[PDB]
């Protein structure tokens, strides 16, 4: 059954490269169309030119982990292609490989930063249900995406959401295993345990990142916006409370607990400052943004929440994008 299963034997000549669409985990992301089928695909470079250890191990992680994961809410690697190996001597071939993904219509980053899309409560339900179903699927397989960002959240015009990169993804083990990179998530979405120096962290790091995304869909603005780790920890304390042994018994274990102390010992004001959020969603946000990762809810528990338990995946409900009347805004409808 070679066909479709045989990878690495196809050349990049079958794809015409349109251009760059954005920057991914390891390389820049490209757009292309297959000559035979006419399908738009997303490509990723391998760049095996560095003869230090040959094929990159971070790429080997993404090939092994993504080929095991199959879900409606995860971008699946379609195939892997290489450059033309024209010499008969496989020793002269220094060509790179390309990862072929499925192309989606838009990404949450481009949609929100431009300000065109608006999310109703039912749209957020469709977004979070697919997002947590995929995250629970990967968490059940003991994997950590470690880079939850709006740029790695892709959406098609039907209303289906999919996760993208997984280049920084590693395996999780209850046994300490390997100490990991303390900073791994974008500072605006970085968990409080990661700021304080936790090197062996739990899968709750992605739950915290998605929690910052849930509130960002209701406010149309990122929750915590800071340029430094101390300033980021301060903004988290102004909302969720300062990390203290009272609400976080193992906070003492973190190295930077005495080093990175907040300005004050703030009280939790999450429900107060998010009073405009429905109670069903506010209850979900409070659990996802819990300081202690052992007290923070899991991906499965979010699907058993009053906000997402009864959401049906048959109703895709795509986010409504304004159309035609947007061509000229601030007209007709004034006051």
């Amino acid at each position: 059954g070679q066909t479709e299963s045989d990878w690495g034997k196809r050349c990049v000549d079958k794809f015409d490269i349109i251009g760059i669409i954005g920057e991914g985990t390891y390389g820049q992301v490209y757009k292309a169309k297959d000559k035979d089928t006419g399908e738009l695909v997303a490509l990723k470079k391998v760049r095996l030119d560095n003869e230090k250890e040959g094929f990159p191990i971070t790429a080997i992680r993404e090939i092994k982990i993504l080929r095991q994961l199959i879900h409606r809410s995860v971008v699946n690697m379609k195939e892997i292609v290489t450059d033309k190996q024209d010499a008969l001597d496989f020793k002269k071939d220094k060509g790179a490989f390309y990862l072929v993904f499925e192309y989606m219509d838009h990404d949450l980053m481009g949609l929100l930063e431009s300000g065109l899309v608006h999310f109703s409560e039912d749209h957020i339900k469709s977004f979070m249900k697919q997002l947590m179903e995929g995250l629970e699927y990967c968490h059940k397989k003991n994997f950590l995406h470690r880079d939850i960002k709006c740029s790695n959240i892709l959406l098609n015009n039907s209303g289906q959401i999919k996760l993208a990169d997984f280049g920084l993804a590693r395996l999780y083990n209850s046994e300490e295993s390997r100490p990991y990179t303390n900073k791994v998530i974008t500072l605006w979405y970085r968990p409080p345990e990661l700021l304080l120096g936790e090197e062996r962290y739990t899968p709750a790091i992605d739950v915290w990142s998605c929690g910052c995304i849930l509130g960002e869909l209701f406010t149309k603005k990122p929750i915590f916006q800071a340029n430094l780790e101390l300033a980021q920890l301060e903004l988290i304390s102004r909302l969720c409370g300062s990390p203290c042994p009272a609400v976080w018994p193992d906070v003492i274990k973190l190295p930077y607990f005495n080093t990175m102390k907040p300005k004050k010992q703030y009280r939790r004001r999450l429900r107060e400052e998010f009073s405009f959020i429905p109670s069903a969603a506010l209850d979900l946000l409070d659990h996802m943004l819990t300081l202690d990762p052992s007290k923070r809810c899991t991906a499965e528990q979010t699907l058993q929440s009053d906000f997402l338990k009864d959401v049906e995946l048959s109703k895709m409900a795509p986010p409504d994008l304004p159309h035609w009347q947007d061509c000229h805004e601030l007209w007709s409808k004034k006051r």
């Binding site: 479709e4 095996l48 250890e53 040959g54 094929f55 191990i57 090939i63 092994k64 496989f90």
Partner: protein, 248 residues
């Protein structure tokens, strides 16, 4: 979806090595040489047992598509172990594997690496990834041998003697084409089946169905006794051929 990595015993007479003039005994010898080479080298480097088998399975699959005469066996085996290290998250530097190879290979055998041993290995990685179709995830009968033994209840010392002896049979089965003939779950049952006969154990008694004379069925479904006897016959062929005796 995923490629098929299993052939039949009769198909081994048509490997690219066989079709280039190599006799069946030589290819089987070249496979045991490459398997033990990957086994001994990774053992010297202190590698995990899953990393050793993953490279050995890459090695076995590679010479299903290519001939031993066109690709040096020890150069290929080093590349499989090097890739298996990055796959199973137990990496070693390419220079460390070459250094271990020179320790275990004589002047004649090490000549396969040419003037630049590192480059001959790094180059072969492209062809290895293409040949294995980038299907890097490989499972081994070890995890299934352990998954099935935990469900056994009885004499702890008798069960432990069963496991280690079967584990020895799994290490010996890597030198064979059994990795290509049958799935790893069936191999783990067959080594339990072989160690049970040698140790004179009634494995059915330790199961949740103490009467189920087909004790293997509660672990792996749809497995005839013909397959178990066939696998046991292949493993014991190594013991009678070589100088090692059956564990017993």
């Amino acid at each position: 979806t995923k490629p098929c990595w299993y052939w039949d015993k009769k198909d081994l007479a048509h490997t690219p090595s066989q079709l280039e003039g190599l006799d069946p005994a030589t290819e089987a010898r070249y496979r045991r040489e490459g398997a033990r080479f990957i086994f001994d080298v990774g053992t010297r480097l202190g590698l995990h047992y899953d990393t050793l088998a993953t490279g050995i399975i890459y090695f076995h699959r590679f010479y299903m598509f290519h001939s031993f005469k066109q690709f040096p066996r020890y150069v290929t085996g080093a590349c499989c172990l090097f890739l298996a290290g990055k796959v199973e998250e137990t990496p070693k530097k390419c220079k460390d594997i070459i250094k271990t190879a020179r320790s275990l290979l004589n002047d004649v055998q090490f000549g396969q690496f040419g003037d630049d041993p590192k480059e001959e290995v790094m180059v072969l990685e492209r062809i290895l990834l293409q040949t294995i179709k980038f299907d890097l995830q490989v499972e081994h009968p070890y995890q299934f041998l352990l998954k099935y033994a935990k469900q056994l209840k009885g004499d702890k010392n008798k069960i432990q003697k069963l496991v280690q002896m079967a584990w020895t049979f799994v290490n010996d089965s890597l030198c064979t084409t059994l990795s290509l003939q049958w799935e790893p779950e069936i191999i783990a049952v067959a080594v339990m089946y072989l160690a049970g006969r040698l140790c004179k154990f009634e494995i059915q008694e330790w199961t949740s169905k103490p009467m189920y004379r087909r004790w293997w069925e509660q672990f792996v479904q749809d497995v005839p006794v013909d397959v178990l006897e066939d696998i046991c016959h292949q493993i014991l062929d190594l013991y009678s051929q070589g100088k090692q005796q059956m564990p017993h």
